[model samples]
Target: LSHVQQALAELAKPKDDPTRKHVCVQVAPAVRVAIAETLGLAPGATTPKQLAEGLRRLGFDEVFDTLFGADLTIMEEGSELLHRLTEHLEAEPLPMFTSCCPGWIAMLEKSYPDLIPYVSSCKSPQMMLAAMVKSYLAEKKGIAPKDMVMVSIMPCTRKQSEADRDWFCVDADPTLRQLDHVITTVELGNIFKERGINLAELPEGEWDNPMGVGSGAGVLFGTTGGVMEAALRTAYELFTGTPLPRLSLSEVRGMDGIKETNITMVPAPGSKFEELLKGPLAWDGGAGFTSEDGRGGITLRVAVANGLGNAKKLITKMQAGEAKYDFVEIMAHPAGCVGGGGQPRSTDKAITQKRQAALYNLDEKSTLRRSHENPSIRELYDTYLGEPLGHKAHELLHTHYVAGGV
Candidate 1:
């Protein structure tokens, strides 16, 4: 009976099938409420949680978590760092830029191609998820990849452009197959209304197989410093052979426009970069030169940036040869996806607090709290791909940045 329900009923009605027409319909409404809450908008007549519950009632085949894709991103990116450290050590400077944010990536490619190498080759989480859905999940479900419909609910309008990037479509056949369609938060609400389905009464569902699993670390990628923290969670464990003393990397989390931190990592026994390359590992960890003496305790340098404006400033410094971090995390939006453009517009501090709290809570409740803990990621390495940055992963998930210096 609501305006949204009425709209949804209209959309669901078949022009030719009058019998099916005007059937009372219900659709999900959480998407709009979630966006609104994320943007600090005033709570509408319906709460976001209520809307989310309603979406389940609308009979959506599945409900996916973007955080799962975020987890996969860390694996690919961490592997990329290791590879880059070995290959490009002597070629460039410190402070490699993160590439999960499409807005930032496009800006660099179009405006600052000279800084391309500094950007990682990994695709964003959304694209990564789409690829998995179309390929791995489709195979598992016995569904035709082409038949599955992928709809991305994002907070940024530019994400549509990101989803369409050639670089992001590495898995598709050259014949030009599209992976998914993107819808804005508000648009999603309109869609639900048009379906005449009440999302409020739907049962909750989970993402489909293969791409559904993720870690707390991956979920954090939605925020600033999230990528760096997630990477550290895995990198530290891989290097030390012991769990991190504390999972809450307070050092990496915060609102600091740009910040840097360092941690020492011990290479696995017999895991000598020198032996692998027959030469010294290039580019010491922001300190001085490193020797080929099989020394351990490499200083892992990290930097975090939340806003694109700050990222631009850091890029300027890097261009001037003044940048000093080994790794950097950049989110295009000020508060990451929580402040994404797709989120509902609002100007209230309380709404932001509530939404952020929900996000952090989701992160905390996850069982596999680190990127390395994601079973699907491990499966990806063990089954089709041999390891992170392996030939297959590189071919599908990695890409080169245009570097003519915009």
Candidate 2:
């Protein structure tokens, strides 16, 4: 059994108080900027301080950024990508698909069942984080999973369905549904105003620790190719055994409807990367080596697409066999979730860019830029789970995507 079970068995299972609802506010990365805009702040004035205070004043128990899940997503996702490349190359599921967006997951599941195997088994960040809140967090807080109320501030409408699903009850009967309610940034605005709370003037505050500390890699999840970029930061290091010259990969960090890039890896001497490539990847196309240093090399290609229209086009091309990629990132919003359905509406394209820029700016200023480097996440492994994609990690964070939909 995984270490998390020991942590679970040690819980006191304290009696619940109806008034002591453990309220967890899962704020998306973009909403930090969206709230700044909604509150008439500067274009670059995106910060969680005000929202944290606002939610606190409204009597919520705790507030957390969804980026925590985003960072965790990169760990699982990047690991899964490598797993496929090294274990199942040239197989039907040679290319790994990201399963972070509910809308895109639903569309592909129903419209393109043939591609289902390609989707990663990892749960969306929201769901994986929700499960953590219940099992891991519940055990930490000494309360039953059912005792806590999980509230997610989402960017897409399909997340509402995600919050409402009972499919996640397998591991724990009480953990069936982690989200008790979900509200969007627009909805968040309404709730704040209905109570006459002025968010702009609220004193700067901080999110609750443990689950609130997130890296810039997590912050980038708001942008179109941010997920792919974040995943690359970690994957490149894990696979090649060397740090990237730079953390930012502008190739995947753009607002294009569909952005693509190919990365050539210089494997470290004695690294398993070379052996893995020689084995499964021998029959794979685009798997090349570098002649400069005599080191075995492999090429990793990835693509990012957002918006339903772009998604449909990309899927069509894949079906038509016009394109090939080792990894794919699909978002429901054109500018990514930063411009999602839940953000306070803006018809202007420039405004969308501002939100995307806001997240990037946060990424730029953040000291920790990689998800795998998040100290809190690192601590999570050291204290609870043993490693990424292990039995415990899979039990808590992985889920299946049914063809029909969630």
Candidate 3:
């Protein structure tokens, strides 16, 4: 048996020792979309629900949706961007790059060390959610941090490397890892097929609570420009105290090598800044609103670049002082995680586009489109976490990157 299989099997073994780890599985949204497409089902909540059922049948102690982590990332990362935009903190330059994709993170650290200051310090969704599981969920489950084994299912092989980072560990005990193992979508599908557990035939099961619920913005993270669009949805509202004029930022959606757009922000009728500052939208760094006209005619310049070459091209333009943006999203792969190297092998050139379409369709069907609108996310802040960029948030959901090459 593989190491993942052995760890999973050990969870069911009779244990008199305190070191027996509780093996829990977490699935990425991209994996569910890929699995559903392979099984001839349109990607949606049903697929994720059924995938949870399949994992439970395989002896997983608990199942979670990584989209929950995606939402948390948007919350923290969005606030981080807002803090930068408002000039609340004097750290980075104008354009802030996303740090969610491990492949992109590695590239920035190795190849583009000069641009490291522009990257957000927020941890990737996988790590953010896994850290919470080790800290929050472990306490809730009455399990010790050392006895929790967090296995992640993802579409990208880079995630396996991301999970093993030395810094992703318990603060009290650095020897205890926050994330233990990572298996790809292709590997998971093979496991299902080899075990004669047809995913299509499985009954739909609900995701375990608190960490299960994710907004449509979270679902969008699988696509090429999803991270930029998702962050804009929440950032626009938080900066203006008004809902985004359009829920779907279609301008950033597509398989284009580089997508660029600008959003004009308008102030709300009556000032809601004080009320917002006191609630879940609060950012301790400083108020995002300072002008009587709300954001005072702030136009956010954003760019989304897929493929390593495209990212390099954008960086060249920025270096040459030709193209400037307030925010940038870079995916090392062709179509983001949908076209990740660890996904199912196929000759279909349009498969990534199809998977991207499924994720957008799922977003359209969701009742909540914005990350900040997720109730569980708000509860997470109210119950355990204080707020975005708060002391606890920085410790758990955020990380600093070092400039080094492999």
RMSD to truth, every model: 7.0, 6.9, 6.2
Better of 1 and 2 by lDDT: 2
Residues 303-382, candidate 1: write the lDDT tens digits: 67778888777766655556556787788776666666766766565554555555433454453466765566677668
lDDT of 1: 0.56
Show how many residue pairs clash in every candidate, following the order shown: 27, 0, 0
Score each candidate by Cα lDDT: 0.56, 0.67, 0.72
Cα lDDT for residue 361, candidate 2: 56
Residue-pair clash count for candidate 3:
0
Q: Return the lDDT, model 3, position 223.
A: 30
After TM-score superposition, what is the CA distance of residue 153 in candidate 1 from its true location, in Å?
0.8
Residue pairs whose backbone atoms clash in candidate 3 = none
Which candidate leads in TM-score? 2
| Candidate 1 RMSD to the correct structure | 7.0
Which whole-number lDDT from 0 to 100 does residue 46 have in model 3? 42
Candidate 3 lDDT over residue span 234-333, tens digit each: 7778767776544333443333587777777654446443333321111233223356644345567777788998788777766766666778889889
Candidate that scores best on lDDT:
3
TM-score of each: 0.73, 0.84, 0.83
The Cα error of candidate 1 at residue 375, in Å, is 2.7
Better of 2 and 3 by TM-score: 2
